[PDB]
Amino acid sequence: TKNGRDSQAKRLGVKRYEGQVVRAGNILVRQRGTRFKPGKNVGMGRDFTLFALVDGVVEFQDRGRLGRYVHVRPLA
Amino acid sequence: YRLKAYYREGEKPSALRRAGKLPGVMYNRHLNRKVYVDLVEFDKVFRQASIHHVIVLELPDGQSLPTLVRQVNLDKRRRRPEHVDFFVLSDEPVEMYVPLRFVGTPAGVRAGGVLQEIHRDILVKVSPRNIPEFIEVDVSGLEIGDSLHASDLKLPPGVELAVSPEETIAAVVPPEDVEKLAEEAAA
Amino acid sequence: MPRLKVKLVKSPIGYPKDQKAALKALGLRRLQQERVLEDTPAIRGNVEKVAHLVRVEVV
Amino acid sequence: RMKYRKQQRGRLKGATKGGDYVAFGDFGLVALEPAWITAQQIEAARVAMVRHFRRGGKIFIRIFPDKPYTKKPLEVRMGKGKGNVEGYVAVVKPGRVMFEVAGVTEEQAMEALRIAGHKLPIKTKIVRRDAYDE
RNA sequence: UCCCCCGUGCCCAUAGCGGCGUGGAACCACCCGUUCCCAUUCCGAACACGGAAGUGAAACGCGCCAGCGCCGAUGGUACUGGGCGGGCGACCGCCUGGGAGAGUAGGUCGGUGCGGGGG
RNA sequence: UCAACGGAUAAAAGUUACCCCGGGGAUAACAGGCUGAUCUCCCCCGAGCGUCCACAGCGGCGGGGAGGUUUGGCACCUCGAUGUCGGCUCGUCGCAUCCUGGGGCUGAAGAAGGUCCCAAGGGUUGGGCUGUUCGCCCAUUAAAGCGGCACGCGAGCUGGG
RNA sequence: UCCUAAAAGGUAACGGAGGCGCCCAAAGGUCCCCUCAGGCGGGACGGAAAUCCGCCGGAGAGCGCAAGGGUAGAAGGGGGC
RNA sequence: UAGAGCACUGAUAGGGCUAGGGGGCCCACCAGCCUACCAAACCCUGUCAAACUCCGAAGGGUCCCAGGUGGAGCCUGGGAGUGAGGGCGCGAGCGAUAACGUCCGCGUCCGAGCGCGGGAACAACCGAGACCGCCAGCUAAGGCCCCCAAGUCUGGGCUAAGUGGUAAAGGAUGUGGCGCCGCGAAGACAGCCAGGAGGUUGGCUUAGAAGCAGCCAUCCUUUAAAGAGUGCGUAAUAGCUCACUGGUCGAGUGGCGCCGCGCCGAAAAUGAUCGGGGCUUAAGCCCAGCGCCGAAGCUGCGGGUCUGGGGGAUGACCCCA
Ligand SMILES: [Mg+2]
Ligand SMILES: [Mg+2]
Ligand SMILES: [Mg+2]
Ligand SMILES: [Mg+2]
Ligand SMILES: [Mg+2]
Ligand SMILES: [Mg+2]
Ligand SMILES: [Mg+2]
Ligand SMILES: [Mg+2]
Ligand SMILES: [Mg+2]
Ligand SMILES: [Mg+2]
Ligand SMILES: [Mg+2]
Ligand SMILES: [Mg+2]
Ligand SMILES: [Mg+2]
Ligand SMILES: [Mg+2]
Ligand SMILES: [Mg+2]
Ligand SMILES: [Mg+2]
Ligand SMILES: [Mg+2]
Ligand SMILES: [Mg+2]
Ligand SMILES: [Mg+2]
Ligand SMILES: [Mg+2]
Ligand SMILES: [Mg+2]
Ligand SMILES: [Mg+2]
Ligand SMILES: [Mg+2]
Ligand SMILES: [Mg+2]
Ligand SMILES: [Mg+2]
Ligand SMILES: [Mg+2]
Ligand SMILES: [Mg+2]
Ligand SMILES: [Mg+2]
Ligand SMILES: [Mg+2]
Ligand SMILES: [Mg+2]
Ligand SMILES: [Mg+2]
Ligand SMILES: [Mg+2]
Ligand SMILES: [Mg+2]
Ligand SMILES: [Mg+2]
Ligand SMILES: [Mg+2]
Ligand SMILES: [Mg+2]
Ligand SMILES: [Mg+2]
Ligand SMILES: [Mg+2]
Ligand SMILES: [Mg+2]
Ligand SMILES: [Mg+2]
Ligand SMILES: [Mg+2]
Ligand SMILES: [Mg+2]
Ligand SMILES: [Mg+2]
Ligand SMILES: [Mg+2]
Ligand SMILES: [Mg+2]
Ligand SMILES: [Mg+2]
Ligand SMILES: [Mg+2]
Ligand SMILES: [Mg+2]
Ligand SMILES: [Mg+2]
Ligand SMILES: [Mg+2]
Ligand SMILES: [Mg+2]
Ligand SMILES: [Mg+2]
Ligand SMILES: [Mg+2]
Ligand SMILES: [Mg+2]
Ligand SMILES: [Mg+2]
Ligand SMILES: [Mg+2]
Ligand SMILES: [Mg+2]
Ligand SMILES: [Mg+2]
Ligand SMILES: [Mg+2]
Ligand SMILES: [Mg+2]
Ligand SMILES: [Mg+2]
Ligand SMILES: [Mg+2]
Ligand SMILES: [Mg+2]
Ligand SMILES: [Mg+2]
Ligand SMILES: [Mg+2]
Ligand SMILES: [Mg+2]
Ligand SMILES: [Mg+2]
Ligand SMILES: [Mg+2]
Ligand SMILES: [Mg+2]
Ligand SMILES: [Mg+2]
Ligand SMILES: [Mg+2]
Ligand SMILES: [Mg+2]
Ligand SMILES: [Mg+2]
Ligand SMILES: [Mg+2]
Ligand SMILES: [Mg+2]
Ligand SMILES: [Mg+2]
Ligand SMILES: [Mg+2]
Ligand SMILES: [Mg+2]
Ligand SMILES: [Mg+2]
Ligand SMILES: [Mg+2]
Ligand SMILES: [Mg+2]
Ligand SMILES: [Mg+2]
Ligand SMILES: [Mg+2]
Ligand SMILES: [Mg+2]
Ligand SMILES: [Mg+2]
Ligand SMILES: [Mg+2]
Ligand SMILES: [Mg+2]
Ligand SMILES: [Mg+2]
Ligand SMILES: [Mg+2]
Ligand SMILES: [Mg+2]
Ligand SMILES: [Mg+2]
Ligand SMILES: [Mg+2]
Ligand SMILES: [Mg+2]
Ligand SMILES: [Mg+2]
Ligand SMILES: [Mg+2]
Ligand SMILES: [Mg+2]
Ligand SMILES: [Mg+2]
Ligand SMILES: [Mg+2]
Ligand SMILES: [Mg+2]
Ligand SMILES: [Mg+2]
Ligand SMILES: [Mg+2]
Ligand SMILES: [Mg+2]
Ligand SMILES: [Mg+2]
Ligand SMILES: [Mg+2]
Ligand SMILES: [Mg+2]
Ligand SMILES: [Mg+2]
Ligand SMILES: [Mg+2]
Ligand SMILES: [Mg+2]
Ligand SMILES: [Mg+2]
Ligand SMILES: [Mg+2]
Ligand SMILES: [Mg+2]
Ligand SMILES: [Mg+2]
Ligand SMILES: [Mg+2]
Ligand SMILES: [Mg+2]
Ligand SMILES: [Mg+2]
Ligand SMILES: [Mg+2]
Ligand SMILES: [Mg+2]
Ligand SMILES: [Mg+2]
Ligand SMILES: [Mg+2]
Ligand SMILES: [Mg+2]
Ligand SMILES: [Mg+2]
Ligand SMILES: [Mg+2]
Ligand SMILES: [Mg+2]
Ligand SMILES: [Mg+2]
Ligand SMILES: [Mg+2]
Ligand SMILES: [Mg+2]
Ligand SMILES: [Mg+2]
Ligand SMILES: [Mg+2]
Ligand SMILES: [Mg+2]
Ligand SMILES: [Mg+2]
Ligand SMILES: [Mg+2]
Ligand SMILES: [Mg+2]
Ligand SMILES: [Mg+2]
Ligand SMILES: [Mg+2]
Ligand SMILES: [Mg+2]
Ligand SMILES: [Mg+2]
Ligand SMILES: [Mg+2]
Ligand SMILES: [Mg+2]
Ligand SMILES: [Mg+2]
Ligand SMILES: [Mg+2]
Ligand SMILES: [Mg+2]
Ligand SMILES: [Mg+2]
Ligand SMILES: [Mg+2]
Ligand SMILES: [Mg+2]
Ligand SMILES: [Mg+2]
Ligand SMILES: [Mg+2]
Ligand SMILES: [Mg+2]
Ligand SMILES: [Mg+2]
Ligand SMILES: [Mg+2]
Ligand SMILES: [Mg+2]
Ligand SMILES: [Mg+2]
Ligand SMILES: [Mg+2]
Ligand SMILES: [Mg+2]
Ligand SMILES: [Mg+2]
Ligand SMILES: [Mg+2]
Ligand SMILES: [Mg+2]
Ligand SMILES: [Mg+2]
Ligand SMILES: [Mg+2]
Ligand SMILES: [Mg+2]
Ligand SMILES: [Mg+2]
Ligand SMILES: [Mg+2]
Ligand SMILES: [Mg+2]
Ligand SMILES: [Mg+2]
Ligand SMILES: [Mg+2]
Ligand SMILES: [Mg+2]
Ligand SMILES: [Mg+2]
Ligand SMILES: [Mg+2]
Ligand SMILES: [Mg+2]
Ligand SMILES: [Mg+2]
Ligand SMILES: [Mg+2]
Ligand SMILES: [Mg+2]
Ligand SMILES: [Mg+2]
Ligand SMILES: [Mg+2]
Ligand SMILES: [Mg+2]
Ligand SMILES: [Mg+2]
Ligand SMILES: [Mg+2]
Ligand SMILES: [Mg+2]
Ligand SMILES: [Mg+2]
Ligand SMILES: [Mg+2]
Ligand SMILES: [Mg+2]
Ligand SMILES: [Mg+2]
Ligand SMILES: [Mg+2]
Ligand SMILES: [Mg+2]
Ligand SMILES: [Mg+2]
Ligand SMILES: [Mg+2]
Ligand SMILES: [Mg+2]
Ligand SMILES: [Mg+2]
Ligand SMILES: [Mg+2]
Ligand SMILES: [Mg+2]
Ligand SMILES: [Mg+2]
Ligand SMILES: [Mg+2]
Ligand SMILES: [Mg+2]
């Protein structure tokens, strides 16, 4: 009875939460599409991954119709 | 209709029900108060009263108030009221559902059939001054398969409807029977 | 604030691991053991969980 | 009907939404106890009701069977039941209104709505219509 | 300090839809033309350039309206960490802390930051 | 298509009732157990049938349950062995009673019968066919009951299957 | 790919459902431009549905293929290099 | 996610509205009008969904800050065993809302606590984590009539079945308690005496259909009263009867709904039984309250050991946790 299939879990989601120090360029969120958009010092790769471009702390922000953004508020 | 209210605050609604006091609220654009009538009492009243007829509430402040029943939430599982709402009226154009007397037995009812009274009341804008105990309906020119919408109404003075001009009030429908069974179970 | 006295009375046996650890943090070794300590927000937090196993006095 | 396929069982926790109030009709029948009511069970009550007052008023049916009923043909363990043997059912939790009658006298509603209760796997109750609305 | 308009950002529908009224003096639009810069899978529609005359019609700014959209309590219940009791069960009840969705009362035709022209 | 996709060789299919060793009740077949869908019985409702008349007698559609004889599900003791159908001998227990005893109802004139209730005390035949159980049949009877006891009974027997 | 999976991640059964073993020198990079589906009305052949004009129409289209997530403030359609 | 919701995908009962279809009158020029039919779209009413979500908890997850010295935590390294698990509570799939069934998730106990008290007996249910000794003490669950420690304890109810001592739809003037409705001293409920009627024989079908098979249904008259009729009955009547009024009588009475305990439904195989005997204002059930018995739990006293600390220049050894 054909059905025993499935794919292996991809383990994705936010990796670093709001108010968390981050090193140069470590990943912050792995997402299916654009559940989140870039931000201050926060670029995104082919798989829509979101990673830091600088050190400092991560902060989230909901911009309604705009989207949900995530960025690093640096310091040094 | 009249009814004696009582003031409430921090006590447990659950505990009140234990004694026999049904909790509820009273409010309008300016008022809002934690209250509770006696169940057995409210029942006698609300049964007769309903959300069509006004109620005079009587607080221990000597205060009388012309409150309409807004909504009553029930205990699913063996029906029974849990908690009430009282809209304190004043003198401005308020809307509210008001009764409906379908007088006269339509052509269908006569020739065997069923009066399906879609509504039993109508949402209509109105002044606290106006509270037509009902609204008669000449439903008698109704043949089997016919209907009566809002557009046809005996609307008393100052009583404009809030609903649609299309929304139907009632209708006559065919009567299910045993001869019907032969056909149903077959096909 | 007042220090809390807390005596253990019902055996923690069979009770979920978490609470096992609470009685540990509250320094509650064995049963029927007395234990007086400061009433801080975080101290109560533990004494809170283990309520069903301890009676709290006030001193 | 359409939907899709076979469906998991799921439990029948408290009769929360399991219930309602009398919509149409003069009287009705409420479930006191949770259960899966079969298609057959339903029709059983229906046809009963009509048969009682021949050429009668109007019977409403507030419940409706959409859960697929799986079952195995007297075997063991490969795959999920081809199911559908009793076919389909309706999730009736304590409180729910199942049938409305209208256009008849009490002694008719009482009797018919009672006879129907004899086809249902459940303890039930027949309601007038108090007044409690909305 | 204030008011009008212009460009820009912010909160992201209480800002929106529609209805009604309103301003061209400055601003903005439309309008005149297409030689030149440049442009249409065809059309100066659009983008682009030169430029008075006309206009506030369209667009837009402003304001009033709630009919639609949008926001929306209170009380109360569902459910529920943690603790306890009951029925063979399908299940149900109590204590302690938490507590909606829906619906109701009601709110809304926005608010504000910077810069520039205009009295 | 090293696709048996972490890929044993470069290079490979059957059969054993002629069979054998190591292991397993970690796992089937018997039986027991748990369960009771299937099975057997009882019951609720009463459309309808029975001239009239829902229960003399009967009961659609659907509902609740008892029992643990069948078919089955699971895999729990038992694979350093718990012998398996049928017959024979000897039985013994249940009662949902086949007969005899007692009783209500009857669409019971009488005789005879229908059906329900009480009631194990004792009784419950001989032969043909088949390994048979089961069943059909012959001739009788008050009747030729059903079922439990490892589908009782192989340190009792048989050994047709 | 989705559900089961109990709002972190994970999570089983001969549990419920469906795909993959490719394709594209443009279906790729960039610069500029552009915005659907669908509904009503008007239109010679057409005709429910070609193409044309109007209005309404925030994403129900589209994104080579399954499904989901995303998405017109482009990832969608056109062009130049 | 539970919940809830219907705005997307689908599902859905009833009605409104309205394309296409069905069927009749009316047609051939094709058109129209009906429709107690089928039905898209749209609307209101009402609802369902693991793989639907406009919405959405308790909670969980992670970072920061603080408490937290614990047979905690981290790092390197030597040594392993284990890779059949099992039951219970909860949340799902499978299963049949079967299984001492199965498969995951969280927890837990057995495993290894078949050691100790409770549950008659019984790994995992309730109580509790056994270092040894004691003819000491408090308590846990459970229990206090005898076997068997300790109350035939106190107070207020209920149950008459041995219910308790462990079965379901469904049933019934079992009994107790609360509530609403109506009747009655201008005389109720019951019983009991009289009428209980007239067109009527209601109309329609049917062989027949006279309140009284089946179908449709709502008159008035004599009156204080008697249904176009309750049930029997005859082939069809009459009949008797309730309904219905008036008298006798003399005080209460009928019903609806909620709650507590009990009754029927209730049939098995070696001999019975709730562990037993026994128990009925209880030795049962519900509420309240004081006391006591009861473990290897805790306290008291003594000893052992190991760790930690303090005394010991001193080791030895001493005290304390
Ligand atoms: Mg799988
Ligand atoms: Mg996956
Ligand atoms: Mg997996
Ligand atoms: Mg998955
Ligand atoms: Mg009037
Ligand atoms: Mg935790
Ligand atoms: Mg000790
Ligand atoms: Mg079923
Ligand atoms: Mg098998
Ligand atoms: Mg009516
Ligand atoms: Mg009525
Ligand atoms: Mg029934
Ligand atoms: Mg029932
Ligand atoms: Mg009932
Ligand atoms: Mg309501
Ligand atoms: Mg100044
Ligand atoms: Mg200044
Ligand atoms: Mg800003
Ligand atoms: Mg205008
Ligand atoms: Mg002008
Ligand atoms: Mg010109
Ligand atoms: Mg030119
Ligand atoms: Mg020129
Ligand atoms: Mg030039
Ligand atoms: Mg020039
Ligand atoms: Mg250019
Ligand atoms: Mg060109
Ligand atoms: Mg020029
Ligand atoms: Mg001018
Ligand atoms: Mg002007
Ligand atoms: Mg204008
Ligand atoms: Mg404007
Ligand atoms: Mg809203
Ligand atoms: Mg709201
Ligand atoms: Mg609230
Ligand atoms: Mg809780
Ligand atoms: Mg809880
Ligand atoms: Mg508690
Ligand atoms: Mg139990
Ligand atoms: Mg809310
Ligand atoms: Mg609403
Ligand atoms: Mg409003
Ligand atoms: Mg607005
Ligand atoms: Mg506007
Ligand atoms: Mg300025
Ligand atoms: Mg200025
Ligand atoms: Mg200035
Ligand atoms: Mg391999
Ligand atoms: Mg190979
Ligand atoms: Mg792998
Ligand atoms: Mg090979
Ligand atoms: Mg070989
Ligand atoms: Mg072989
Ligand atoms: Mg062999
Ligand atoms: Mg051979
Ligand atoms: Mg041979
Ligand atoms: Mg041979
Ligand atoms: Mg040979
Ligand atoms: Mg050999
Ligand atoms: Mg061997
Ligand atoms: Mg085994
Ligand atoms: Mg077996
Ligand atoms: Mg059974
Ligand atoms: Mg069969
Ligand atoms: Mg059967
Ligand atoms: Mg029975
Ligand atoms: Mg029988
Ligand atoms: Mg019936
Ligand atoms: Mg009957
Ligand atoms: Mg007949
Ligand atoms: Mg009948
Ligand atoms: Mg039938
Ligand atoms: Mg049958
Ligand atoms: Mg049956
Ligand atoms: Mg059944
Ligand atoms: Mg049955
Ligand atoms: Mg059954
Ligand atoms: Mg059965
Ligand atoms: Mg078996
Ligand atoms: Mg197993
Ligand atoms: Mg041996
Ligand atoms: Mg032996
Ligand atoms: Mg008997
Ligand atoms: Mg019999
Ligand atoms: Mg006899
Ligand atoms: Mg005789
Ligand atoms: Mg007899
Ligand atoms: Mg042979
Ligand atoms: Mg014989
Ligand atoms: Mg025998
Ligand atoms: Mg057997
Ligand atoms: Mg057997
Ligand atoms: Mg045998
Ligand atoms: Mg032998
Ligand atoms: Mg033998
Ligand atoms: Mg033998
Ligand atoms: Mg031989
Ligand atoms: Mg032979
Ligand atoms: Mg042989
Ligand atoms: Mg996934
Ligand atoms: Mg999803
Ligand atoms: Mg998850
Ligand atoms: Mg998921
Ligand atoms: Mg959870
Ligand atoms: Mg989780
Ligand atoms: Mg779930
Ligand atoms: Mg998740
Ligand atoms: Mg499944
Ligand atoms: Mg290849
Ligand atoms: Mg190209
Ligand atoms: Mg278009
Ligand atoms: Mg149009
Ligand atoms: Mg045309
Ligand atoms: Mg066309
Ligand atoms: Mg056209
Ligand atoms: Mg979108
Ligand atoms: Mg596609
Ligand atoms: Mg796709
Ligand atoms: Mg997902
Ligand atoms: Mg997609
Ligand atoms: Mg998508
Ligand atoms: Mg989307
Ligand atoms: Mg899409
Ligand atoms: Mg592009
Ligand atoms: Mg591209
Ligand atoms: Mg290009
Ligand atoms: Mg929807
Ligand atoms: Mg709806
Ligand atoms: Mg619908
Ligand atoms: Mg429909
Ligand atoms: Mg519909
Ligand atoms: Mg219809
Ligand atoms: Mg038509
Ligand atoms: Mg039509
Ligand atoms: Mg037609
Ligand atoms: Mg014709
Ligand atoms: Mg016609
Ligand atoms: Mg003709
Ligand atoms: Mg038509
Ligand atoms: Mg509309
Ligand atoms: Mg709508
Ligand atoms: Mg609606
Ligand atoms: Mg609406
Ligand atoms: Mg969901
Ligand atoms: Mg969402
Ligand atoms: Mg909403
Ligand atoms: Mg909301
Ligand atoms: Mg936390
Ligand atoms: Mg810390
Ligand atoms: Mg190591
Ligand atoms: Mg394993
Ligand atoms: Mg396991
Ligand atoms: Mg484990
Ligand atoms: Mg486990
Ligand atoms: Mg189980
Ligand atoms: Mg352990
Ligand atoms: Mg033992
Ligand atoms: Mg036991
Ligand atoms: Mg053990
Ligand atoms: Mg044990
Ligand atoms: Mg003592
Ligand atoms: Mg005590
Ligand atoms: Mg005690
Ligand atoms: Mg007493
Ligand atoms: Mg007493
Ligand atoms: Mg007993
Ligand atoms: Mg019962
Ligand atoms: Mg009853
Ligand atoms: Mg009675
Ligand atoms: Mg009188
Ligand atoms: Mg007469
Ligand atoms: Mg006559
Ligand atoms: Mg005649
Ligand atoms: Mg007569
Ligand atoms: Mg007759
Ligand atoms: Mg008249
Ligand atoms: Mg005679
Ligand atoms: Mg005759
Ligand atoms: Mg007569
Ligand atoms: Mg009374
Ligand atoms: Mg019997
Ligand atoms: Mg008590
Ligand atoms: Mg007590
Ligand atoms: Mg004391
Ligand atoms: Mg000790
Ligand atoms: Mg000592
Ligand atoms: Mg030292
Ligand atoms: Mg030293
Ligand atoms: Mg020293
Ligand atoms: Mg020395
Ligand atoms: Mg010394
Ligand atoms: Mg010393």
PDB file of N, CA, C and O (backbone and C1' of nucleotides) in Angstrom, chain H residues 5-16:
ATOM      1  P     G H   5     -17.184  29.159  16.890  1.00  0.00           P
ATOM      2  O5'   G H   5     -16.363  29.819  15.694  1.00  0.00           O
ATOM      3  C5'   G H   5     -16.077  31.209  15.772  1.00  0.00           C
ATOM      4  C4'   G H   5     -15.207  31.670  14.616  1.00  0.00           C
ATOM      5  C3'   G H   5     -15.746  31.276  13.252  1.00  0.00           C
ATOM      6  O3'   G H   5     -16.657  32.260  12.815  1.00  0.00           O
ATOM      7  C1'   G H   5     -13.476  30.677  13.394  1.00  0.00           C
ATOM      8  P     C H   6     -18.001  31.810  12.079  1.00  0.00           P
ATOM      9  O5'   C H   6     -17.506  31.716  10.566  1.00  0.00           O
ATOM     10  C5'   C H   6     -16.659  32.759  10.085  1.00  0.00           C
ATOM     11  C4'   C H   6     -16.052  32.461   8.721  1.00  0.00           C
ATOM     12  C3'   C H   6     -17.036  32.056   7.623  1.00  0.00           C
ATOM     13  O3'   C H   6     -16.568  32.536   6.341  1.00  0.00           O
ATOM     14  C1'   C H   6     -15.485  30.336   7.930  1.00  0.00           C
ATOM     15  P     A H   7     -16.599  34.095   5.923  1.00  0.00           P
ATOM     16  O5'   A H   7     -15.434  34.224   4.845  1.00  0.00           O
ATOM     17  C5'   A H   7     -15.232  35.490   4.249  1.00  0.00           C
ATOM     18  C4'   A H   7     -13.767  35.674   3.920  1.00  0.00           C
ATOM     19  C3'   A H   7     -13.114  34.380   3.495  1.00  0.00           C
ATOM     20  O3'   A H   7     -13.119  34.384   2.075  1.00  0.00           O
ATOM     21  C1'   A H   7     -11.860  35.425   5.261  1.00  0.00           C
ATOM     22  P     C H   8     -13.669  33.136   1.239  1.00  0.00           P
ATOM     23  O5'   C H   8     -12.325  32.378   0.808  1.00  0.00           O
ATOM     24  C5'   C H   8     -11.282  33.112   0.165  1.00  0.00           C
ATOM     25  C4'   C H   8      -9.968  32.342   0.074  1.00  0.00           C
ATOM     26  C3'   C H   8     -10.076  30.874  -0.319  1.00  0.00           C
ATOM     27  O3'   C H   8     -10.132  30.725  -1.726  1.00  0.00           O
ATOM     28  C1'   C H   8      -8.704  31.061   1.565  1.00  0.00           C
ATOM     29  P     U H   9     -11.216  29.706  -2.310  1.00  0.00           P
ATOM     30  O5'   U H   9     -10.593  28.272  -1.992  1.00  0.00           O
ATOM     31  C5'   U H   9      -9.282  27.963  -2.413  1.00  0.00           C
ATOM     32  C4'   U H   9      -9.054  26.493  -2.145  1.00  0.00           C
ATOM     33  C3'   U H   9     -10.316  25.673  -2.347  1.00  0.00           C
ATOM     34  O3'   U H   9     -10.347  25.222  -3.680  1.00  0.00           O
ATOM     35  C1'   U H   9      -9.374  25.183  -0.241  1.00  0.00           C
ATOM     36  P     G H  10     -11.726  24.722  -4.306  1.00  0.00           P
ATOM     37  O5'   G H  10     -12.253  23.808  -3.100  1.00  0.00           O
ATOM     38  C5'   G H  10     -13.541  23.184  -3.093  1.00  0.00           C
ATOM     39  C4'   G H  10     -13.572  22.052  -2.077  1.00  0.00           C
ATOM     40  C3'   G H  10     -14.952  21.823  -1.483  1.00  0.00           C
ATOM     41  O3'   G H  10     -15.683  20.951  -2.344  1.00  0.00           O
ATOM     42  C1'   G H  10     -13.316  21.928   0.265  1.00  0.00           C
ATOM     43  P     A H  11     -17.262  21.112  -2.492  1.00  0.00           P
ATOM     44  O5'   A H  11     -17.767  20.471  -1.122  1.00  0.00           O
ATOM     45  C5'   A H  11     -17.324  19.172  -0.765  1.00  0.00           C
ATOM     46  C4'   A H  11     -17.656  18.878   0.684  1.00  0.00           C
ATOM     47  C3'   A H  11     -19.091  19.218   1.011  1.00  0.00           C
ATOM     48  O3'   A H  11     -19.884  18.126   0.636  1.00  0.00           O
ATOM     49  C1'   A H  11     -17.670  19.991   2.745  1.00  0.00           C
ATOM     50  P     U H  12     -21.189  18.426  -0.236  1.00  0.00           P
ATOM     51  O5'   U H  12     -22.161  19.067   0.869  1.00  0.00           O
ATOM     52  C5'   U H  12     -22.549  18.222   1.951  1.00  0.00           C
ATOM     53  C4'   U H  12     -23.098  18.972   3.150  1.00  0.00           C
ATOM     54  C3'   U H  12     -24.340  19.799   2.884  1.00  0.00           C
ATOM     55  O3'   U H  12     -25.473  18.972   2.892  1.00  0.00           O
ATOM     56  C1'   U H  12     -22.825  21.062   4.150  1.00  0.00           C
ATOM     57  P     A H  13     -26.480  19.133   1.670  1.00  0.00           P
ATOM     58  O5'   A H  13     -27.880  19.388   2.400  1.00  0.00           O
ATOM     59  C5'   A H  13     -28.388  18.448   3.335  1.00  0.00           C
ATOM     60  C4'   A H  13     -29.169  19.167   4.419  1.00  0.00           C
ATOM     61  C3'   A H  13     -30.176  20.193   3.922  1.00  0.00           C
ATOM     62  O3'   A H  13     -31.382  19.578   3.490  1.00  0.00           O
ATOM     63  C1'   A H  13     -28.917  21.144   5.650  1.00  0.00           C
ATOM     64  P     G H  14     -32.112  20.170   2.196  1.00  0.00           P
ATOM     65  O5'   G H  14     -32.770  21.542   2.728  1.00  0.00           O
ATOM     66  C5'   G H  14     -33.726  21.519   3.808  1.00  0.00           C
ATOM     67  C4'   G H  14     -34.180  22.881   4.336  1.00  0.00           C
ATOM     68  C3'   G H  14     -34.530  23.933   3.302  1.00  0.00           C
ATOM     69  O3'   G H  14     -35.860  23.715   2.876  1.00  0.00           O
ATOM     70  C1'   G H  14     -33.102  24.887   4.903  1.00  0.00           C
ATOM     71  P     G H  15     -36.360  24.060   1.389  1.00  0.00           P
ATOM     72  O5'   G H  15     -36.230  25.668   1.296  1.00  0.00           O
ATOM     73  C5'   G H  15     -37.261  26.508   1.832  1.00  0.00           C
ATOM     74  C4'   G H  15     -36.818  27.923   2.176  1.00  0.00           C
ATOM     75  C3'   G H  15     -36.571  28.869   1.008  1.00  0.00           C
ATOM     76  O3'   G H  15     -37.784  29.348   0.437  1.00  0.00           O
ATOM     77  C1'   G H  15     -34.833  29.091   2.560  1.00  0.00           C
ATOM     78  P     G H  16     -37.853  29.716  -1.117  1.00  0.00           P
ATOM     79  O5'   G H  16     -36.992  31.064  -1.224  1.00  0.00           O
ATOM     80  C5'   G H  16     -37.457  32.241  -0.566  1.00  0.00           C
ATOM     81  C4'   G H  16     -36.567  33.465  -0.750  1.00  0.00           C
ATOM     82  C3'   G H  16     -36.247  33.869  -2.187  1.00  0.00           C
ATOM     83  O3'   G H  16     -37.262  34.750  -2.722  1.00  0.00           O
ATOM     84  C1'   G H  16     -34.241  33.725  -0.928  1.00  0.00           C
TER      85        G H  16
END
